[PDB]
Symmetry: D2
């Protein structure tokens, strides 16, 4: 319903938040090109959801693969309304001494250069149409320290800055650009069924500021749907946190004086 | 659909963004109490919309009326799911030499003290329910100068701070608190197009950062609907700008070098 | 000697961060008018500091007293270079259920309405001078929740918003406006009471993000001195946190996993 | 006298803001190691400033050169009190279509990867000392769009994020980390030729929000001196704008309605 006839690309679409968004976009009448490098999981998802959902292999660090992915999408569906640049790799809290120069450049390539290229070539086909929507997956670490690694933190800050520059430049052509910044969702790893899922959703239940709710990838997908739809038709330049208020509080003082 | 069985109170509900939100909440199956001091406009709206929409006179500077309004809502519908604290008066850009102490205190009473009272008494009846949602109308002046008066700007910053400390305290009870900060909204004129819409586009087309779109009171109602719905069930502490990216740019530098 | 010949007004100048700044301003050659309602403490500080330091009773909620105070400063010293709008009352973390409408309005009058009046009447005499500096005492609660009460928090946000519109309007006249947002400040007992200082470090050494250092009123005064001096001659619109990084971290996640 | 006996390293110290900070540090009793890749400019400055100021060639993209530069400073002076990570190249505002993937990676290496390496190896010799200070040169583009290129902007956001997580990690060891974010300064950006000095001063006076003052490299150096001194001994995690309020205003609306 809400994305009837819209064409959307989702990088990192074969798993996690990307997969949830591909599924949600599908349920709302969108044509979605899943862009990923886990070809077996990604093609399975596209085949599983039917004719509007195609899979395209794209390593977002390779500009030629990104260029083709976008050119293929316009060729297939006539244009791209929504670019959800979501591919990235994750680092938990670490030390500056744990930062290896090669692993920093590797993460910057996937997380930040990939966002640049995905945006550049989405803009390439959106600007002539004078319409379109670019959404980046950032992270709640963009608003509070203590929940992600140094290299990762710098890369997501860089995305926020890129998102704001594009919101201005592409505003002249009627195109919006925003970020969604989730607070830790269960994804990836070996799904150590009960062991990993119970341990995660028990930690997050003590860590979160908003009690009685656990953030799932499906929750993030719904916020992406909001940003991508005409219900957000005047929303641009925004880094929208989905974090239950985690980033607005430092509870140390209150914890210390009462315990 | 999206607010089926939910009970909402809307201050400043008889006109403008409040009236638009009341109408949209009604369309989504919510029970709505319009709270205002424009008894003619407010009662007329409630009668037109039917059984689920009522009108209650409430001056938000009067704590007895604010307490009575929330207690009557529980008595009538059994609880309050959504408090949309939206009542306020507006000031365009002005000079500090124009700030009159009595007008400052009057605006603070309506804009900022009224928000405290609505949140205090909503929280009182939401906390036992272990669920609920407080949404304030702030303003895009909370993130850029140059679009609102001195007294008004300080009152809306105060609301943002209240919202963030409410998101922390009330998060322990499963309750969310957020702000919507709209930019240039056309109100007061009879919509469905008009002479009044097109020419307002004439102003905003030179002012806005996002070209080819004007913000309407109905667009803002839609963003409040998102924040108030279960689609935002892990969004809290957020001041959500609806400004087309106006607040993320100062184009003076680009303007001067391209003159 | 960084404020040689400069004229400063300090609201809430009779104690705490205000008094520390009054003393530091005096040490740097400033002429200071202490503005407060603690007449005895305030007159004593002014008498003790000498010819360049005066004292004026001024309830910042009373606009006539605020206008009179600034006009007296111009009449006495020829103008006002620095307005340190610092008067206010504090609230530690509390519940919205504790917010009393009369105490909310009382605090708003002092913390936020007083900030408007001080700034209005400073701007009035600074604009003809084409120079000057308005500095507000805000608070680190403007950038993190959990360290101040509801009413207090809203009043300090209001100050930040007021500061930013002032930086714009007064920027055209060469006038700067900034906030200082300190964290856990000792204030209370200025005289060398070691018992109270070490005990305060017992709390702050567990609460603060920057370890091995405690913030004092004299440290806040030094940061105000920077903002008020020509070393900050192009700093404007800034809410300057003095918090050791407290407001940039929520350590709950790391605490739970470790 | 304000940095008497302190040991400071300044990357990009041979020109511009870096050189200005080196001389001001020299004037305040500091021992300074100038770190740059412009060997003739840097060695000239170290010779003229005397015994306390030396020069070390260091390309900030090579971790071994950064490693050696910090070890050489410790070998000579016994430790490092101040790391002024200032090296970078600048981009004026541009279009996303102008972003070349190779140039993006080149700028990321200098601006952001270089900051990472400088901070890592400063932290290496500061953490045992239980004292120290890391200062990054970011940019006013970190708080509004419209004054820098896309690649440059994303790199300076990344620096801010890195600064925030260091202030937390290094806070437990008594070490502070901050950014200084200047607006437009006449340096090695536009040539020493006086035909470009009368023009740069004229643009900045029209563009700035604070009138009657032009930002110079010496003004920034003084703000770095504040951040690096014991006068800011409880300031950490701060991105300190030196911009005259440029980033807090979008004057478009006021410009059009009074045009
Ligand atoms: N999972 C969390 O807890 C969490 C928290 C905050 C932010 N995020 C962000 O959300 C985004 C999505 O991650 P996720 O949580 O859904 O886990 P995920 O790993 O299952 O999904 C991310 C996908 O990115 C793809 N990827 C890696 N390199 C790629 C490349 N070069 N080209 C194309 N795809 C590539 C992976 O194949 C993967 O399917 C990421 O950008 C991540 O940084 C996640
Ligand atoms: N119009 C804009 O462009 C704009 C821009 C930014 C923010 N806002 C905010 O939007 C909010 C909604 O106003 P609107 O723009 O839709 O038009 P509006 O002013 O007509 O509606 C606001 C209502 O607040 C009510 N009000 C004033 N005092 C009250 C009191 N004591 N008790 C109860 N109600 C009281 C008014 O009666 C009014 O109907 C306001 O808080 C306003 O500040 C509007
Ligand atoms: N104490 C802390 O830890 C802390 C933390 C964050 C912010 N602050 C801010 O520092 C500011 C100064 O207070 P302080 O902490 O130094 O304690 P303080 O008691 O020593 O100073 C407060 C001053 O405000 C004055 N005051 C109250 N009402 C006044 C009025 N009507 N007119 C004139 N002066 C009036 C008081 O007399 C007093 O001199 C306050 O705005 C406070 O919020 C303090
Ligand atoms: N001048 C301005 O208007 C302005 C505005 C905002 C930010 N900045 C920042 O100020 C910082 C300092 O640069 P500047 O403006 O003084 O101009 P600058 O070119 O005169 O000084 C920067 C120095 O970095 C050096 N550099 C380049 N690559 C290097 C490398 N790989 N290793 C070591 N040094 C290298 C340059 O040689 C130069 O001496 C930069 O990071 C810049 O981004 C400047
Ligand atoms: C294994 C992994 O958890 C190590 O990271 C913890 C660490 C704790 O610092 C945060 C505290 C607020 O000072 C640094 O590791 C310390 C050694 C002793 O294990 C994380 O520090 C980075 C901040 C930014 O999150
Ligand atoms: C620096 C520049 O952008 C500020 O202009 C001053 C200003 C212009 O308004 C005039 C117009 C009739 O409303 C607005 O002040 C800036 C505030 C918005 O922060 C001064 O206003 C004088 C009249 C409105 O009483
Ligand atoms: Cl935050």
């Amino acid at each position: 319903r809400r994305l009837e006839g819209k064409v959307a690309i989702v990088t990192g679409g074969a798993s996690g938040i990307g997969a949830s968004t591909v599924r949600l976009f599908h349920d709302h009448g969108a044509k979605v090109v899943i862009a990923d490098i886990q070809d077996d999981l990604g093609q399975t998802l596209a085949d599983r959801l039917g004719r509007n959902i195609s899979y395209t292999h794209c390593d977002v660090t390779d500009e030629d693969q990104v260029r083709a992915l976008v050119d293929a999408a316009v060729a297939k569906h006539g244009g791209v309304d929504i670019m959800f640049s979501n591919a990235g790799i994750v680092e938990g809290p670490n030390s500056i001494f744990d930062v290896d120069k090669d692993e920093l450049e590797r993460l910057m390539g996937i997380n930040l250069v990939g966002a640049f290229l995905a945006a550049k070539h989405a803009a390439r086909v959106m600007v002539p149409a004078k319409k379109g929507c670019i959404i980046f997956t950032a992270s709640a670490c963009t608003e509070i320290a203590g929940i992600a690694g140094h290299s990762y933190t710098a890369s997501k800050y860089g995305i926020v800055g890129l998102m704001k520059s594009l919101a201005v430049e592409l505003g002249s052509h009627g195109i919006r650009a925003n970020c969604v910044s989730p607070f830790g969702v269960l994804t990836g790893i070996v799904p150590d069924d009960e062991a990993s899922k119970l341990m995660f959703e028990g930690i997050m239940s003590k860590v979160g500021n908003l009690k009685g709710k656990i953030l799932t990838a499906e929750d993030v997908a719904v916020t992406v749907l909001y940003l991508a739809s005409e219900e957000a038709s005047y929303v641009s330049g925004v880094n929208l946190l989905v974090d239950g208020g985690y980033t607005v509080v430092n509870p140390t003082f209150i914890n210390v004086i009462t315990a």
